[PDB]
């Protein structure tokens, strides 16, 4: 029975999540965007 307000919060937390993942797994498995490589 979710609100728009809540959906939107959920989208915003999905973004942080994926932004984080991209930074963690993209340089490692492609050897590019080398500022986030570890």
């Amino acid at each position: 029975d979710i609100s728009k307000v809540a959906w939107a919060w959920f989208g915003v937390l999905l973004a942080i999540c994926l932004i984080g993942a991209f930074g963690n797994y993209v340089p490692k498995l492609f050897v590019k965007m080398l500022m986030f490589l570890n």
Partner: protein, 35 residues
């Protein structure tokens, strides 16, 4: 200078994700139990 700014951004995101997640647990608790 630039490390510091980068670190502040990660910490913000963590607070947005953990507090944000906790309140979603409450909302979800609320929808199940009632309204």
């Amino acid at each position: 200078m630039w490390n510091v700014v980068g670190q502040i951004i990660s910490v913000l995101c963590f607070f947005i994700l953990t507090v944000g997640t906790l309140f979603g647990i409450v909302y979800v608790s609320h929808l199940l139990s009632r309204g």
